[PDB]
Amino acid sequence: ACKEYWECGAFLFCIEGICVPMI
């Protein structure tokens, strides 16, 4: 995932640096 996992939170999908919730 993204480098800083905690930036996204708990399990997110990264799209160009943006951590979005995966469907």
UniProtKB/Swiss-Prot annotation:
Compartments where found: Secreted
Protein known as: Peptide HSTX-I
Family statement: Belongs to the annelide toxin family.
Classification lineage: Eukaryota, Metazoa, Spiralia, Lophotrochozoa, Annelida
Coiled coil: none
Full-protein positions shown: 26 to 48 of 49
Note in the entry: Does not show effect on voltage-gated calcium channels, potassium channels, and tetrodotoxin-sensitive sodium channels. Does not show activity on Nav1.7/SCN9A, and shows very weak activity on cation channel TRPA1.
Primary location: secreted
SS bond partners: C2-C14, C8-C19
Tissues where this protein is expressed: Expressed in salivary glands. Highly expressed in the head, body and tail with a 2-3-fold higher expression in the head.
Summary of the function given for this chain in its UniProt record: Leech salivary gland peptide with unknown function. It was originally described as exhibiting analgesic function by specifically inhibiting rodent Nav1.8/SCN10A and Nav1.9/SCN11A voltage-gated sodium channels, as well as showing analgesic activities in several mouse models. In a second study, the synthetic peptide has been shown as having very weak activity on Nav1.8/SCN10A at the highest concentration tested (90 uM) and as being only very modestly active at hNav1.9/SCN11A, with a modest peak current size reduction (~19%) at high concentrations (10 uM).
UniProt entry keywords in alphabetical sequence: Amidation, Disulfide bond, Secreted, Signal
Cellular component aspect of the GO annotation: extracellular region
Residues with PTM Isoleucine amide: I23
Transmembrane feature ranges: none
